[PDB]
Amino acid sequence: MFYHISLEHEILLHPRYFGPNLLNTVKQKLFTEVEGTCTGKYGFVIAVTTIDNIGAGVIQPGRGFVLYPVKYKAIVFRPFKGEVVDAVVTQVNKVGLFTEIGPMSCFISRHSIPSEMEFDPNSNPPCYKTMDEDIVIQQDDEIRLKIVGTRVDKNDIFAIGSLMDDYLGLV
Amino acid sequence: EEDASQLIFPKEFETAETLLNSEVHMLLEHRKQQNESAEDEQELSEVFMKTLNYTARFSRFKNRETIASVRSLLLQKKLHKFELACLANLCPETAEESKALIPSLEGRFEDEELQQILDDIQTKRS
Amino acid sequence: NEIRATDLPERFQLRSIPVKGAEDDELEEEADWIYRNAFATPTISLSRKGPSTIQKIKEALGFMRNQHFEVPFIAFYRKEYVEPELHINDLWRVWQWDEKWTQLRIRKENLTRLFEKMQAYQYEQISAIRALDTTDMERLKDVQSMDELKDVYNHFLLYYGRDIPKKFGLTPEQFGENLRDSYQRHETEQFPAEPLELAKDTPEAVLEGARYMVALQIAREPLVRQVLRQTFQERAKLNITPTKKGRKDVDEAHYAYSFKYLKNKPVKELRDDQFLKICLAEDEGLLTTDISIDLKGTYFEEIKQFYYRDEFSHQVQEWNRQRTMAIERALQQFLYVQMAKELKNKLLAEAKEYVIKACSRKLYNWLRVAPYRPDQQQGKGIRVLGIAFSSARDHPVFCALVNGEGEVTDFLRLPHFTEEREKKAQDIETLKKFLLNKKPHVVTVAGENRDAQMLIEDVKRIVHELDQGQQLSSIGVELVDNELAILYMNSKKSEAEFRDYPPVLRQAVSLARRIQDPLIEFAQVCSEDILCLKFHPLQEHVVKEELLNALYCEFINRVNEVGVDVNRAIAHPYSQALIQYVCGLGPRKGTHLLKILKQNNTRLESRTQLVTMCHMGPKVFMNCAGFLKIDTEVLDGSRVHPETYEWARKMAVDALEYDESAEDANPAGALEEILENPERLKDLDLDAFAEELERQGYGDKHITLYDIRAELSCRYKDLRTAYRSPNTEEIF
RNA sequence: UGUUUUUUUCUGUCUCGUGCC
């Protein structure tokens, strides 16, 4: 789920960057350092909205590099277990379904899916229907799910969905 | 132990600020509008594009005033912050569906008290 | 067990996957579906005509469903029931059409069942803008309309509701009819009321409440899809024009970048020209593509008049405005987007078809077995001297002298080359020593650049001047492009034949095999192995599954036309594993037969070896009777199957004028004399043979008479082409 | 209508005595 929290970070600036654009250079470096990354503490970060302030640059002894402990006001996306969101199905396979929760991709197996949704390998587009063929679920459809698990593959979140609770499909 | 169903989160995340799909959508749209201008700038990455096309398919309302009103009419209640995003984003039809999806609502409030809120949310949709 | 010990052949089972056989009533439906879906956009099977083509397709489908017939088995064995040699893609096309008809029928049945269930549910609910279950019958009947039928079904589901417990403007049908006919027969809601009054009877206080409902009804209407379908897909002058970034990124490499201002490309350029479709798809992938018909601006204007009121005085004007708004809403919802999606799907299908056709043409051109045997037919075959040198610059060039029986006899190296800056004798001496070491039958030299060609020419000149071809005659070293031998040298067969050998020896062996029996090398490779050879750049854009299927069908047809030697795949590894692309003898069946032959040690005694030894089933034997060949009965190593053995013997006796007494082996004048050469052809009449087949046999022999006569006169006929010598451009 | 080479920081033990600012 997307959130707006206040984070902090420090970046060493090489002395060649000193000059009238010092603050601009620090901001530019901050933008291209904490956008799109991920961490196991705060989760996946989308982008930065604004910066609070620039700390006092403490020049290191015997080294020209100076660090600026900046505190930026950026957004973050850290999904938790039990949350329910609305994603879009990307691909349908007999092994399982694939979706895309924004910057993360989950996966639901046939076991999680009830027995009513069978396979349609004969038809060209992989899809799942029922005996009466009333409800139809395919790709590019806003289908909900439940985040029953979480995982971080070295700054690459990959949760797992489920389809056991009622009211999970076309709105 | 971290399960949002039972309303438990780490200490750092407890003091977070919730965001709605439309809110993040307009924030990213404005960021894109600002970044596209001012030439000689590093263009957006695939992450921004995927997030944009992901939040654009769930924008229940484009008007910012709609977001303001739906957050104002909701914050007056006694629900936690976590209940402000999922319920405002999914927009269930009946109170039964909302109670089923979110187990926290089971026994927290009456039936009509939640049905009226859901009807108001549905009407607020464009 | 089910693949090898099954009642029906492997090919027949694989072809009719979605449709497990064809019923008597379903044969006509499948034939109609195949004929309707045989050539819609391009001209294909227009050869066989419309009604004749449909009848032939139906006969082929019926034969496949009844006798478990296959592609080649029905194209050759059923030349009368199907197009008699109308085209190569006869059996495969018929199988595809039958599968498509069966799939369409199954989908229509499912849709009809769903519509009936929905109608019953609606009657149960509301029977205790209505919801009537009348469109289920139409959807079930719409078998040909696949995409349109699906759209209509989805629209019905979204309109009625789809829930499964356990007066605003013109009507949808009237609007659809008025749009399809081009004349607005029904106008909007001709009433004094306007959007102000209609927006108060839902609780929104907005005049756009009914517009959304009208748009949803128009988009989710099969009539609208049918009317829009084919209007732009039939013709769409796609204007190719690079963008600001595509002009420099494409560099005139794709379809949307080659023409800076070359627009107005109709559907013929994309569908017929698969290259244009592939280029558009590639350009539209990352940078951008210029795909716009630009013909609506006038197709969307005519619809505007229809469905709208003509008068304007409040009630009439309000109704006309509401109708216009609803039409605009429906168009924005599923009007332009639906047409664009349909055009994109059609373009992708055309590009895939063009890629598949190019791959099939390349496979047919490169798969024809055209070896260079002795005299272009002492000992069987010729000793191909595979010379696959590396550089020809003082490095060891592989030069293997393989025999004509699908095996390598010997080889050698030639490290000395013209290494030494000025040495015009060491290479000649090495070539002379290599030629004197063995007695090859032909020279098969490779080539990589000008130096390789010069080295090959020098070797050929040395061999011809000193009579190094056979030690007692000049042998012409036939040029061989380093295309198949290089790939075959580093294959599974090359590794198994020689493990402790350098790559030069493997390349020489592959080159020698490629110029002795291309069919053996093609059948003894994985088909992976075929996919290595690129048929065309446009095939990459299209799905490779279609190309692989076309290549497999072409290989199967070539194997059936040329036949398979039973003894060749018993002890010789080079000519083994050739029972994978036979008509009715699938890969599992061929592997099982090979294993049985290796275990029991059974030889190709006759055509009934697999029917008498209990190795192959009756359906398998019947479908693969025209493809299995043996070395020795008399009509075993030919296309004559057991059913036509008596007819062939009788025809041979009549043509040779010999005695008639249970001739299967004993009379050889009619068999051996006719096999040696044509004895008497006027004795055997086509009308008499056909009459005999019809009276006794239960089948006309008008088309099969020629095939039977050819089999009796020539056994084990090869369908491969001749030896193609490299040309100037081809050599380069 | 041609022209032969590419591998690199090693490393040593514990004890006693003598001389020098």
From Swiss-Prot, chain C:
Residues 31-732 are annotated as: Interaction with KDM6A. The keyword Chaperone applies. It comes from the Eukaryota. It is found in: Nucleus. GO terms for cellular component: nucleoplasm; transcription elongation factor complex. GO terms for molecular function: DNA binding; histone binding; nucleosome binding; RNA binding. The modification N6-acetyllysine is found at residue 357. The keyword Cytoplasm does not apply. Disulfide bonds: none annotated. Ubiquitously expressed. GO terms for biological process: blastocyst formation; mRNA processing; mRNA transport; nucleosome organization; regulation of isotype switching; regulation of muscle cell differentiation; RNA splicing; transcription elongation by RNA polymerase II. Keywords: Acetylation, Chaperone, Host-virus interaction, mRNA processing, mRNA splicing, mRNA transport, Nucleus, Phosphoprotein, Transcription, Transport. Its main location: nucleus. Histone H3-H4 chaperone that plays a key role in the regulation of transcription elongation and mRNA processing. Enhances the transcription elongation by RNA polymerase II (RNAPII) and is also required for the efficient activation of transcriptional elongation by the HIV-1 nuclear transcriptional activator, Tat. Besides chaperoning histones in transcription, acts to transport and splice mRNA by forming a complex with IWS1 and the C-terminal domain (CTD) of the RNAPII subunit RPB1 (POLR2A). Belongs to the SPT6 family. Interacts with RNA polymerase II and the DRB sensitivity-inducing factor complex (DSIF complex), which is composed of SUPT5H and SUPT4H1. Interacts with KDM6A. Interacts (via SH2 domain) with SETD1A. Interacts (via SH2 domain) with POLR2A phosphorylated at 'Ser-2'. Interacts with IWS1, AICDA and PAAF1. Interacts with histone H2B and H3. Interacts with WDR43. (Microbial infection) Interacts with human cytomegalovirus/HHV-5 protein UL69. This is Transcription elongation factor SPT6. It comes from Homo sapiens. The gene is SUPT6H.
